[PDB]
Amino acid sequence: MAVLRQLALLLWKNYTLQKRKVLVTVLELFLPLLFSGILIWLRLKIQSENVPNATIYPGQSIQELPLFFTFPPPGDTWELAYIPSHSDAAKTVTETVRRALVINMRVRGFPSEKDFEDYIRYDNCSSSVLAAVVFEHPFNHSKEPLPLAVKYHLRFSYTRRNYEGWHTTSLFPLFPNPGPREPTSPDGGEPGYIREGFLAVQHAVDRAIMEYHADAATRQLFQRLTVTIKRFPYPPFIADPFLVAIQYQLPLLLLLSFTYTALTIARAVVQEKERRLKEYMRMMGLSSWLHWSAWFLLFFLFLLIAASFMTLLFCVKVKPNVAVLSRSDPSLVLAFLLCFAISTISFSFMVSTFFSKANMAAAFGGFLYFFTYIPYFFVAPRYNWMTLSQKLCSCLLSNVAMAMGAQLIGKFEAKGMGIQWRDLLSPVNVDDDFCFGQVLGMLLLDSVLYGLVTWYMEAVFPGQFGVPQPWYFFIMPSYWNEYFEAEPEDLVAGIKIKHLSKVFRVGNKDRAAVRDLNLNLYEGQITVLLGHNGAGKTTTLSMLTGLFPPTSGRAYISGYEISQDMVQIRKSLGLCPQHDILFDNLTVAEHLYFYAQLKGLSRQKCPEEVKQMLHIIGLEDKWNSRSRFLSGGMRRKLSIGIALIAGSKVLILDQPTSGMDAISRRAIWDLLQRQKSDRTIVLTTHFMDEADLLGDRIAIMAKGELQCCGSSLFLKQKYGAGYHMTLVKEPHCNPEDISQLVHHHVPNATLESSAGAELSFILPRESTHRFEGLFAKLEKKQKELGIASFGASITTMEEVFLRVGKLVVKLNTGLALHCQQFWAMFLKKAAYSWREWKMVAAQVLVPLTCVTLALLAINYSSELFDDPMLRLTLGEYGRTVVPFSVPGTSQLGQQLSEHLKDALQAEGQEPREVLGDLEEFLIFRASVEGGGFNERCLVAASFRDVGERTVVNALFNNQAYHSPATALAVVDNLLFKLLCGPHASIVVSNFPQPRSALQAAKDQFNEGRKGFDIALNLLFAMAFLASTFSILAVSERAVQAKHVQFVSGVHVASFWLSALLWDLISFLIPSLLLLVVFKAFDVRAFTRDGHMADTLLLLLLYGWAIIPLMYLMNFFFLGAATAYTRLTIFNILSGIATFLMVTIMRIPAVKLEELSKTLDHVFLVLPNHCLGMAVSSFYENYETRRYCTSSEVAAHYCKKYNIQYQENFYAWSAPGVGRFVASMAASGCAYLILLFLIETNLLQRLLPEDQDVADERTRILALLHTPLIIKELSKVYEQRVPLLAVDRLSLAVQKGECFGLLGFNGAGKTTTFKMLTGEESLTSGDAFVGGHRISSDRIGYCPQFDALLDHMTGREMLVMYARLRGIPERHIGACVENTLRGLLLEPHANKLVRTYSGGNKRKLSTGIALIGEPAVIFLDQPSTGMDPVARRLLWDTVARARESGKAIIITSHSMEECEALCTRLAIMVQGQFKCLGSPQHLKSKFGSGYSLRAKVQEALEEFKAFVDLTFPGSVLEDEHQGMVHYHLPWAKVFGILEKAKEKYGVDDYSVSQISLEQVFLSFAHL
Ligand SMILES: Nc1ncnc2c1ncn2[C@@H]1O[C@H](COP(=O)(O)OP(=O)(O)OP(=O)(O)O)[C@@H](O)[C@H]1O
Ligand SMILES: Nc1ncnc2c1ncn2[C@@H]1O[C@H](COP(=O)(O)OP(=O)(O)OP(=O)(O)O)[C@@H](O)[C@H]1O
Ligand SMILES: *[C@@H]1O[C@H](CO)[C@@H](O)[C@H](O)[C@H]1NC(C)=O
Ligand SMILES: *[C@@H]1O[C@H](CO)[C@@H](O)[C@H](O)[C@H]1NC(C)=O
Ligand SMILES: [Mg+2]
Ligand SMILES: [Mg+2]
């Protein structure tokens, strides 16, 4: 029941996410209609004729040869032959035949048929033979007589001889058009059969047989009757030349409308597992088959609306009874489209499981969809030769199975009835056995076949974020030291780690991340894991939670062996990652509700729980606000809320409180204290008071190995000595002054590190007596040496970490500046094709296999074979009916009709007397029966007499090919039977002659579709190649690595021209690899006289005109993968769709050619259309020029009909590419201009507060040496409820200073930096940096969130910014080493900044903002994920950069740096300042410069008595069950605690001058 209660949850989530992008949804829901509207518009344009009256034809006469064979061929006379030559009968028959055909002819003779075939194809005196009678009889010893039952062939020519062959491969034309097959020519048609004298010779031989058998009765017979042949009259019809036009590319219009959802599904499924959003929901509890179901139900509704709109505008009558698919029962069309939609969803699901990156999934799942359709180019021509097995074997691809259904829809449509639910098992004609149900069967078998592949790949090859399974997973039935403390035996071990390890694949050396871990974490207490930046701590936690498998070892979360069955562990797991994983466009209460329901919590008690969590975390006013906005410190709060909601037995937190203010860290600490009773908790943290306040056992990792493990006291009394003391010096101070005094008073002590203004000391316990003197000595003389805010404590935790770690120039400008900024960007872009070589592979191979498989299917479909033998008899068609009439009541007419009646019934046919004027009966039945009349009535007879002489008409249905011969054979059969015995028949066959070798080398015309196919398969390749030039340009702006580059001062021309130049170089390679292909296949129009350069010019000119456009179009998008799949469809609409429409709309048969001019003039502004038409015209012009020049015999024919070719190849006139070249050349310039006009913002114009805060608003309002000036600055975010983020924020900073700018979470800091730099827009304010105003018109920038290029390494990212700011090439190695070494990045100097750590990216992002020595510097939380050792080096760098006169404005949350390197603090809340002045000013506000902090109900209450009766006037606050904090109103308070510990029950204490954090907390209740 939970499964159905969770499927509804997933569906609700998908519906909510879709509801908030309606423009995108409506847009992509009506893209499939721009391909099916082409047809519904063409159907209004093209019109019918409706011929009203029937068509009649006159008879012929087959007594003699046509009036063309009386003239002998040039050179000799006509020649005749017979195959059995060793028999006298076979010669005496042919002699009679020769006499009958009264011309000059000569006979021959051969010993077999093989000799005749060779003489035809291996000689030159041949090719004058007329026919060749072949008798199929054994014929012993030249004395055998002709049997009663004779049969023979007639070998006629292979070419149309009487001014395509004989079509003996089929009985009906493949695709028939309405009206008579040959409207004129009342003598037959395409195979002729009367022009070539087939009927004449056949009748002569049929009479020769009778003259041989009787010779006396046959003369008396053939003196009173003659046989003549007529044609059926055709009924009235309508003309409508529509279906014939759109028949070859109906499948290409059905595929090209589902293509978009095909390449949307593939990347929408992959970029939500590349984003770690699938592993996250699986970790929190989610069945993997409830996700596929949600995806399927999401993507089936779209294709159900689209498949209904297509069915709607495939059946509605636009004009009375005219609609597309004029009669096809819309139900079955809809069923076909649904059966295609299911399959094209399953195919995308299967494809998406081969890729792990959304870019390659989008670039290779839109290509595989079309790649699956290519083998139809080899099936369409040779469809009449395949077998049913070979037709079902090629239906295993869904696109081919759709193509061979869209073919039958046309074939059934242009015949009669169409598609009707009662023909699912009956083929079209009597020649192919292929039903329509066999298409729907394979289209539904393919879905299952693809599902069985997506079920296996998703389980054995999970990619980069899953934990795999063995290759046989379906077989089993269960699928369906002395630094280390001594472990406690009073607890239960939750997690047990044993010899765990992990090795990565950097370079070729197998560097290790974790190595041989051993640990045990117990239930009911918190274990804190410490370490520096890059020593496990996330590889361990990502391996305990199943994000990727261990290299070796094992671990037992609850006895479950994480590598064996983690599906049981993930029932009670709950975690928060280092970088949050949230849904944009999904509010906060929605997030909490969804993730409480997912885990299992009941629906009754959910809302109160969500309210409790919203109150706890602190997100109250941010309720129902989208996660995309938030702040930066609220993201972590929401993540923690999600992690703790619904309860969990195992909590795994990875840096939870990183980026929050203190007032909320305390609340998080309190909750974690209250929720550790009966669960295990694992923490990784970088604040060293957190690891002491809330921690029962602590572990520290050096470089993948465990250093120490134990409680918080055993560790302190092993590494420190006795105590600690810290100081903060003033500007004019010297360390030796303090050091010598300390040595003279306290001998044994060692300075730790003077990291800025810290200058700390370490003292042992053996010198505890000499404390008061040294304390008073510095108490009295604070001002002399400049010590502000001194403090002392007892061996804090921050020192144990240090002990463990230690134990183991004139800048370029002018020309040389631009020549350097250009080279830097050129290398930045070029190093992107070296690191992701999959993209360059897709750029070089995709455009090539689409052309080498279209030139391969053009050579293949251009060959003829043999014209097999056909048996000309009724009975090849089935059970036909054969009407006849005998009007005239005369003898010899009924005694023939009775023979006709009996012979057919013996054959198996059905006669039908009419008695009533055969012609009108035929016309009426042909109009009432419909299209089924052509399959059951094919011959007829009428026995009429004219003046004592009988005339036998032999009608034939010309809708079939071989009807005349069949009719004449039926007549001659009964004629032979009349005068001989009833067992006497004649059987005739065609079997034409074979083609020779000399006559098979004519091949003059080749235009046909041979240029159209090349130009179409080039467009389908350049649609995919040309979309890859916007991937880097979008992914470099989504990360906001472009905003920092422009802040650092890159000229726009330098940014864009180098990108254009590298893209042109990258585009040149396929344009040079296409020439090799055109040479290999010997395509003449692009290989001959000088056209090799003219083709490359076309390709390079298209590459010049599309590349600037793919830069303009990239401004819409925010994602790199979701821009490929929309630019690809933009390149198809403006390409193939229009080219396909214009080619159809210029056929002579359809009477609309003039409109294809006013459309072709509009489509010139589209750069994809121009290339296709240019290639097509270049191909057509070469052929029409090579034909009107070969000989004068064709030169006059060319001007007979005005073939109209060009000699220039570049003229303006039609068959010359002048205007296409002009329009492609004038588009690149018009796009570069428009891009440079938009990149330079030229198309953009087209209350009693504190006194000190109020004084700054006047000192600047009532300045040449000030780098930065802010006055009356404001910012409002309008969201139907305006939110004021900045309120007048007036202030000014001078040189050599360090402004503080503190605040709470979400107050104003980042949104201030944005306006200062230029990211966001201004409203009612002004400011000046470096003097020059920013409201109208050398600074560094370290943004809050890392904006780095993942394909570059650490040192290259620094070299780029060294080049962007002068720094001559000579003096650059020193300037890079000084920044890598002085920031502790030497180990990671060149390691591809994509595999860096959480803090190893903050180090680099800070090092970028300081290299080059800029004037102003904007730091924005520079140190969040940095450990103490590196956080101290950051302070040294910031101080040494400020002592050299540079304005600096940091923005941080920790306080020990805000007092170690700051000079003018400012606490701002709700978007306005509340205090300014030096930190000493703030601290000496209300005096009482003494504080305390102890650490241990009854014990604390008793220990409060001592400090209450000893320190009256206490204002104590903020206790943490031991952390009672005292703000007393120096050697007189440290000496007190020299005996009050034995009877006070404490272990540590810190007494110091008043804390800055207390001043900060004083503003809390506001
Ligand atoms: N996908 C990866 N490919 C190659 N090496 C990696 C990959 N991920 C991490 N590493 C390396 O393995 C080591 C593991 O570091 P890890 O990220 O676990 O440290 P961390 O504790 O998360 O750092 P921080 O304290 O900043 O959070 C790092 O030195 C890192 O360089
Ligand atoms: N793009 C935006 N659209 C609408 N509102 C926003 C946007 N960005 C921030 N806000 C809102 O305006 C306020 C300003 O947030 P700001 O960026 O100053 O937070 P912050 O002080 O940088 O947080 P932290 O210092 O913890 O990172 C926030 O409370 C936030 O809710
Ligand atoms: C072609 O035929 C002629 C006579 O018809 C003959 O003289 C000539 O040799 C033949 N060609 C060849 C190559 O033998
Ligand atoms: C003569 O023809 C018959 C066929 O009727 C055949 O069986 C026989 O072999 C032939 N005679 C000889 C000598 O082969
Ligand atoms: Mg980490
Ligand atoms: Mg911020």
Short mmCIF file of N, CA, C and O in Angstrom, two decimals, residues 583-623:
data_model
loop_
_atom_site.label_atom_id
_atom_site.label_comp_id
_atom_site.label_asym_id
_atom_site.label_seq_id
_atom_site.Cartn_x
_atom_site.Cartn_y
_atom_site.Cartn_z
N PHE A 583 15.90 21.04 -5.21
CA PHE A 583 15.10 21.31 -6.40
C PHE A 583 14.92 22.81 -6.54
O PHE A 583 14.35 23.45 -5.65
N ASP A 584 15.40 23.37 -7.64
CA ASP A 584 14.97 24.71 -7.99
C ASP A 584 13.50 24.68 -8.37
O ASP A 584 12.97 23.66 -8.81
N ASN A 585 12.82 25.81 -8.18
CA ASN A 585 11.38 25.91 -8.44
C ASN A 585 10.60 24.97 -7.53
O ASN A 585 9.62 24.35 -7.96
N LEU A 586 11.03 24.84 -6.28
CA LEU A 586 10.28 24.07 -5.30
C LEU A 586 10.54 24.69 -3.94
O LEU A 586 11.70 24.80 -3.52
N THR A 587 9.48 25.08 -3.24
CA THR A 587 9.60 25.92 -2.06
C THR A 587 10.17 25.12 -0.89
O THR A 587 10.55 23.96 -1.01
N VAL A 588 10.24 25.78 0.27
CA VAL A 588 10.89 25.19 1.43
C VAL A 588 9.96 24.22 2.14
O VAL A 588 10.34 23.08 2.45
N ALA A 589 8.73 24.65 2.42
CA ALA A 589 7.76 23.75 3.03
C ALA A 589 7.46 22.57 2.12
O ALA A 589 7.24 21.46 2.60
N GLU A 590 7.47 22.79 0.81
CA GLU A 590 7.32 21.69 -0.14
C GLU A 590 8.47 20.70 -0.03
O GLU A 590 8.25 19.49 -0.04
N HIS A 591 9.70 21.20 0.07
CA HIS A 591 10.85 20.32 0.25
C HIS A 591 10.68 19.45 1.49
O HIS A 591 10.84 18.23 1.43
N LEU A 592 10.36 20.08 2.62
CA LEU A 592 10.25 19.33 3.87
C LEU A 592 9.10 18.33 3.81
O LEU A 592 9.24 17.19 4.27
N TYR A 593 7.96 18.74 3.25
CA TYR A 593 6.83 17.83 3.13
C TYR A 593 7.18 16.62 2.28
O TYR A 593 6.93 15.47 2.68
N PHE A 594 7.79 16.85 1.12
CA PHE A 594 8.15 15.76 0.23
C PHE A 594 9.12 14.80 0.89
O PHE A 594 8.94 13.58 0.84
N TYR A 595 10.16 15.32 1.53
CA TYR A 595 11.16 14.42 2.09
C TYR A 595 10.74 13.82 3.42
O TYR A 595 11.38 12.86 3.87
N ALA A 596 9.71 14.34 4.08
CA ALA A 596 9.13 13.62 5.20
C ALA A 596 8.24 12.49 4.72
O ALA A 596 8.22 11.42 5.33
N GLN A 597 7.49 12.71 3.64
CA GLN A 597 6.62 11.65 3.12
C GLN A 597 7.42 10.52 2.49
O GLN A 597 7.02 9.36 2.57
N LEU A 598 8.54 10.85 1.85
CA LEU A 598 9.33 9.83 1.18
C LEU A 598 9.85 8.79 2.16
O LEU A 598 9.84 7.59 1.87
N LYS A 599 10.29 9.23 3.34
CA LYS A 599 10.94 8.33 4.28
C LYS A 599 9.95 7.35 4.90
O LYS A 599 10.34 6.23 5.26
N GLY A 600 8.69 7.74 5.05
CA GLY A 600 7.69 6.79 5.52
C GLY A 600 6.69 7.37 6.49
O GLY A 600 5.71 6.70 6.85
N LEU A 601 6.90 8.61 6.91
CA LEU A 601 6.09 9.23 7.95
C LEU A 601 4.63 9.31 7.54
O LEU A 601 4.32 9.56 6.37
N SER A 602 3.72 9.09 8.49
CA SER A 602 2.30 9.03 8.20
C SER A 602 1.77 10.38 7.75
O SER A 602 2.32 11.44 8.07
N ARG A 603 0.68 10.35 6.98
CA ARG A 603 0.08 11.56 6.46
C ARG A 603 -0.71 12.33 7.51
O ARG A 603 -0.93 13.54 7.33
N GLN A 604 -1.12 11.68 8.60
CA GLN A 604 -1.89 12.36 9.63
C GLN A 604 -1.04 13.37 10.40
O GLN A 604 -1.47 14.50 10.63
N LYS A 605 0.16 12.96 10.80
CA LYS A 605 0.99 13.73 11.72
C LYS A 605 2.12 14.47 11.02
O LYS A 605 3.15 14.76 11.64
N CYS A 606 1.96 14.78 9.74
CA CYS A 606 3.02 15.47 9.01
C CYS A 606 3.06 16.98 9.25
O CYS A 606 4.13 17.53 9.54
N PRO A 607 1.93 17.70 9.15
CA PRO A 607 2.00 19.18 9.20
C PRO A 607 2.60 19.73 10.48
O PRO A 607 3.37 20.70 10.43
N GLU A 608 2.27 19.14 11.63
CA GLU A 608 2.86 19.62 12.88
C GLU A 608 4.37 19.41 12.90
O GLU A 608 5.11 20.27 13.39
N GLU A 609 4.83 18.28 12.37
CA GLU A 609 6.26 18.02 12.30
C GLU A 609 6.96 19.04 11.41
O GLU A 609 8.03 19.56 11.75
N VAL A 610 6.35 19.36 10.27
CA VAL A 610 6.96 20.35 9.38
C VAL A 610 6.99 21.72 10.04
O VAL A 610 7.98 22.45 9.92
N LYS A 611 5.93 22.08 10.76
CA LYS A 611 5.93 23.35 11.48
C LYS A 611 7.04 23.39 12.53
O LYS A 611 7.74 24.40 12.67
N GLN A 612 7.21 22.29 13.27
CA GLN A 612 8.27 22.23 14.26
C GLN A 612 9.63 22.44 13.62
O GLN A 612 10.45 23.21 14.13
N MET A 613 9.88 21.77 12.50
CA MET A 613 11.19 21.92 11.85
C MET A 613 11.41 23.32 11.31
O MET A 613 12.51 23.87 11.44
N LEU A 614 10.38 23.93 10.71
CA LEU A 614 10.51 25.30 10.23
C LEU A 614 10.82 26.26 11.37
O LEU A 614 11.62 27.18 11.21
N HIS A 615 10.18 26.06 12.53
CA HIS A 615 10.51 26.89 13.68
C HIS A 615 11.94 26.65 14.15
O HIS A 615 12.66 27.61 14.47
N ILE A 616 12.37 25.39 14.20
CA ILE A 616 13.69 25.08 14.75
C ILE A 616 14.79 25.69 13.90
O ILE A 616 15.61 26.46 14.39
N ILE A 617 14.82 25.35 12.61
CA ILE A 617 15.99 25.70 11.80
C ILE A 617 16.15 27.21 11.71
O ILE A 617 17.27 27.73 11.78
N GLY A 618 15.05 27.94 11.59
CA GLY A 618 15.14 29.39 11.53
C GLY A 618 14.50 29.94 10.28
O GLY A 618 14.26 31.15 10.17
N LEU A 619 14.21 29.06 9.32
CA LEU A 619 13.54 29.45 8.09
C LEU A 619 12.05 29.54 8.38
O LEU A 619 11.31 28.55 8.36
N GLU A 620 11.60 30.75 8.70
CA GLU A 620 10.19 31.01 8.95
C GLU A 620 9.59 31.96 7.94
O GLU A 620 8.58 31.65 7.31
N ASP A 621 10.20 33.13 7.76
CA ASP A 621 9.77 34.08 6.74
C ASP A 621 10.17 33.65 5.34
O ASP A 621 9.64 34.21 4.37
N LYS A 622 11.08 32.69 5.21
CA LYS A 622 11.44 32.17 3.90
C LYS A 622 10.57 31.00 3.48
O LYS A 622 10.78 30.44 2.40
N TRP A 623 9.62 30.61 4.32
CA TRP A 623 8.57 29.67 3.94
C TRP A 623 7.96 30.02 2.59
O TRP A 623 7.86 31.20 2.24
#
